[PDB]
Enzyme design. Structure first.
Site, short mmCIF file in Angstrom:
data_model
loop_
_atom_site.label_atom_id
_atom_site.label_comp_id
_atom_site.label_asym_id
_atom_site.label_seq_id
_atom_site.Cartn_x
_atom_site.Cartn_y
_atom_site.Cartn_z
N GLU A 134 0.81 -1.21 0.00
CA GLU A 134 0.00 0.00 0.00
C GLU A 134 0.85 1.28 0.00
O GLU A 134 0.60 2.21 0.76
CB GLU A 134 -0.98 0.03 1.22
CG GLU A 134 -1.86 -1.21 1.29
CD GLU A 134 -2.86 -1.24 2.51
OE1 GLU A 134 -3.06 -0.20 3.25
OE2 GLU A 134 -3.44 -2.36 2.68
N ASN A 188 2.40 -5.27 -2.78
CA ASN A 188 0.95 -5.50 -2.53
C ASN A 188 0.12 -4.20 -2.45
O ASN A 188 0.52 -3.27 -1.70
CB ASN A 188 0.88 -6.25 -1.19
CG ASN A 188 -0.33 -7.18 -1.05
OD1 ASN A 188 -0.50 -8.13 -1.81
ND2 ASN A 188 -1.10 -6.97 0.04
N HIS A 230 -10.03 -6.25 -2.46
CA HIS A 230 -11.14 -5.72 -1.66
C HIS A 230 -12.23 -5.21 -2.60
O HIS A 230 -12.37 -4.01 -2.84
CB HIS A 230 -10.75 -4.61 -0.65
CG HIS A 230 -9.66 -5.00 0.29
ND1 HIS A 230 -8.91 -4.07 1.00
CD2 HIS A 230 -9.14 -6.22 0.60
CE1 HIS A 230 -7.99 -4.71 1.71
NE2 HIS A 230 -8.10 -6.01 1.47
N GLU A 258 -6.21 -10.74 -0.70
CA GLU A 258 -7.21 -10.52 0.37
C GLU A 258 -8.65 -10.48 -0.17
O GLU A 258 -9.47 -9.64 0.20
CB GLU A 258 -6.90 -9.24 1.23
CG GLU A 258 -5.40 -8.99 1.47
CD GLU A 258 -5.04 -7.78 2.45
OE1 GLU A 258 -5.98 -7.13 2.99
OE2 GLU A 258 -3.80 -7.52 2.68
N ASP A 260 -12.27 -10.47 -1.12
CA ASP A 260 -13.56 -10.43 -0.46
C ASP A 260 -14.51 -9.56 -1.31
O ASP A 260 -14.05 -8.62 -1.97
CB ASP A 260 -13.39 -9.86 0.95
CG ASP A 260 -14.58 -10.17 1.83
OD1 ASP A 260 -15.43 -11.04 1.45
OD2 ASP A 260 -14.69 -9.55 2.92
#
Ligand SMILES: [Cl-]
Ligand SMILES: [Mg+2]
Ligand SMILES: [Mg+2]
Length: 293
Positions: A134, A188, A230, A258, A260
């Protein structure tokens, strides 16, 4: 049928877990469905080095030993981040209680020491590390200039825009001294389906890899890009494809770290999970892992 079996030749199927996973009833579902795990919290910088020189690996070791004992692989998360990262790494309190950046020499030593001590402590127990997480602003207005697009986090303020490259160089040195360890080094980020952000990330990786490649006979400094995934039920799947094809053209491997799908309906998730898995299958030669959070 377990996801793990369906995508056997395609990519690792992963999950993010805590200590209370790995017990009894939660443990058997974990193994049945997943080949790889990521620790949700236990390998972050605050958990591994909470004060200067004071490495605390007991809890992380316990977890990773058990995952390995259970036949699963481990993805390491995360060496460098502006959240869950203790202040002493890159700041200090001045005489009037204001927090101020440390100098570049001192912060760079801290950065390199944390990366290297952690990577050496786990050795070959991980299959990959997220070295940096990030680092890019959301919706950067000038993605042609990746350095101007970097989030101005505490590492940035202490070291400057080359902290990303330095972090990967610190990690790469560890792998060069220990060539028996098979570990991919990842960068990432999230909102990777925003085309400005994907562009800024692509330009950063390309510049960093190119300069490294030219000095080291074509070897990559950054092995992988992680799309956090995300997503939400309104996520445009053609945007996710553009971004994925864009990251693949760097010759890096790609992972989804990650995954979702939240609300802006169960049905809307199914629509999107199927579009995504379709897209992954299509590019499975380039995707190492897909991990749900
Ligand atoms: Cl501990
Ligand atoms: Mg693959
Ligand atoms: Mg620990």
């Amino acid at each position: 049928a377990p996801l793990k079996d369906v995508y056997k030749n395609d990519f690792l199927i992963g999950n993010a877990i805590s200590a209370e996973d790995l017990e009894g009833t939660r443990l058997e579902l974990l193994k049945m469905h997943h080949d790889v795990v990521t620790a949700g919290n236990a390998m972050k910088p605050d958990a591994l080095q909470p004060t200067k020189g004071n490495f605390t690996f007991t809890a992380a070791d316990a977890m990773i030993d058990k995952v390995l004992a259970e036949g699963m692989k481990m993805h390491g998360h995360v060496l460098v981040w502006h959240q869950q990262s203790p202040a002493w790494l890159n700041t200090k309190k001045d005489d009037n209680n204001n927090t101020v950046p440390l100098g570049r020499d001192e912060a760079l030593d801290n950065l390199r020491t944390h990366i290297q001590t952690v990577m050496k402590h786990f050795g070959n127990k991980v299959i990959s590390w997220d070295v940096v997480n990030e680092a890019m602003n959301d919706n950067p207005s000038n993605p042609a200039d990746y350095k101007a697009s970097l989030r101005q986090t505490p590492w940035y303020q202490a070291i400057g825009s080359d902290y990303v490259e330095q972090a990967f160089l610190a990690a790469r040195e560890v792998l060069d001294e220990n060539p028996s360890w098979n570990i991919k080094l990842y960068y990432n980020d999230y909102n990777e389906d925003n085309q400005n952000k994907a562009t800024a990330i692509y330009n950063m990786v390309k510049d960093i890899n190119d300069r490294y490649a030219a000095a080291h006979n074509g070897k990559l400094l950054i092995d992988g890009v992680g799309m956090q995934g995300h997503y939400n039920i309104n996520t445009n799947p053609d945007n996710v494809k553009l971004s994925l094809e864009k990251f693949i053209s760097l010759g890096v491997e790609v992972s989804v770290s990650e995954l979702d799908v939240t609300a802006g309906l169960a049905v809307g998730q199914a629509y999107l999970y199927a579009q995504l898995f379709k897209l992954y299958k299509e590019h499975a030669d380039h995707i190492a892992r897909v991990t749900f959070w």
